[PDB]
Amino acid sequence: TNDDKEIAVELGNILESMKKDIKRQQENTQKVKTAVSDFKLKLIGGELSDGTI
């Protein structure tokens, strides 16, 4: 079952659906880790995500 709550049964379709989903979870996770590190490095200091010290 994908992120979109739809089901996939065949091996040639699951491996392609999982490839979209793992690709979808990384770019969500990078949006998370950016906002975490933006929240940390605004507190402690250093380069933010935009490049602003």
């Binding site: 490095l41 402690i44 200091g45 250093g46 380069e47 010290i53």
Partner: protein, 49 residues
């Protein structure tokens, strides 16, 4: 692989950033000496982690 005390290090990274903003030299070239040093050391701790 003998001995690495990052408690002595991640303090020392943080104090360099702490002493960067703290310094009161009143001169314009140490003010971009330390800023270039400290922005390395903060990024050094990040890039090590």
């Amino acid at each position: 692989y003998p001995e690495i005390n990052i408690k002595a290090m991640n303090q020392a990274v943080n104090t360099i950033w702490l002493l960067a903003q703290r310094q009161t030299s009143g001169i314009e070239i140490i003010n971009d000496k330390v800023k270039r040093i400290s922005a390395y050391s903060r990024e050094f701790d990040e890039m090590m982690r």
